[PDB]
Amino acid sequence: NAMEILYIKGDATAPIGSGVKVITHICNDIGGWGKGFVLALSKKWKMPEEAYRQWYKSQEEFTLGAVQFVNVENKLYVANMIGQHGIYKDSKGLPPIRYDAVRQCLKEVALFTIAHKASVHMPRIGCGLAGGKWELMEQIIKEELITKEIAVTVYDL
Numbered sequence: 500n501a502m503e504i505l506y507i508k509g510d511a512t513a514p515i516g517s518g519v520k521v522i523t524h525i526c527n528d529i530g531g532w533g534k535g536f537v538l539a540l541s542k543k544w545k546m547p548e549e550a551y552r553q554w555y556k557s558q559e560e561f562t563l564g565a566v567q568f569v570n571v572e573n574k575l576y577v578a579n580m581i582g583q584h585g586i587y588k589d590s591k592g593l594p595p596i597r598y599d600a601v602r603q604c605l606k607e608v609a610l611f612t613i614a615h616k617a618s619v620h621m622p623r624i625g626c627g628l629a630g631g632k633w634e635l636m637e638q639i640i641k642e643e644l645i646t647k648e649i650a651v652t653v654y655d656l
Contacts, residue, residue, distance in 0.1 A: 502645045504637065504653055511654040512539045514620035519574045521612055523621045525582040525601060525629060528563055530555030534586075536622045540577065546570070547577040554579070564603030568611055578611070580604035583629045594630020598639065601625065605643035618650035 507515065514520045524536050532541075532548050541548045550569045554561055567579040582604050583595035601624070612619060625631020644651050 502648050502650060504640060504645060504651045506653045506655060508656065509654045510539060510656050511536070511620050511622045511652075512543050514575070514654075515652060516618065516650075519576075519615045519617035521568070521576045521578050521608065521615070521617050521619050522571075523578045523580055523605075523608055523619055523624065525596075525604075525624045525631075526551060526579050527583045527586055527595065528561070528581050529585055530561075531586050535627060539622075544571040544577070547579055551579045563597055563600035566604045566607040566611075576611075576615075576617070578604075578608050580608070582625070586628075588630070596625045596629040596631040598631075598635060601636070602639050602643060605639060609643050609647055609649065612644070612649050613647065618652070619644055620652050620654065622654055622656070 511522055514522060532551060546569050550567055554567050563581055565581045569577050571577055582597055582601035584597055585595050588594050623633060625636050626633055640651060
């Protein structure tokens with residue numbers, strides 16, 4: 500019980516603190532990169548977007564629950580986590596967010612972060628158009644990261 504999610508004001512593309520850092524965000528499964536946090540990423544680094552777009556074309560494990568890790572600076576990675584289905588709600592009004600997919604992604608982030616002695620930095624992942632409910636998303640993050648003593652910072656903006 501040593502760790503707790505930290506919430507601060509700011510921009511997850513400008514992560515706080517020291518050591519190796521992984522910026523985690525939720526991507527869709529159709530290769531779309533044009534709305535929300537991805538725009539903040541691409542302002543600062545071309546690599547996450549380009550890696551993701553190449554991944555979409557490769558169709559090599561481009562599936563819900565999969566994660567691509569890209570280096571953007573000395574000691575800084577971005578995790579492109581495929582955690583939402585499509586961009587818009589489906590025919591029965593189900594929002595794109597897939598909580599099970601996000602959890603699977605976070606299991607892979609946990610292993611990566613442990614191996615690299617890293618901390619996690621994120622926006623309020625899933626909130627907004629993906630239709631995620633923070634009270635649920637937060638619980639998944641606590642279970643998959645915080646309980647293993649991986650620091651997590653959520654950036655409000």
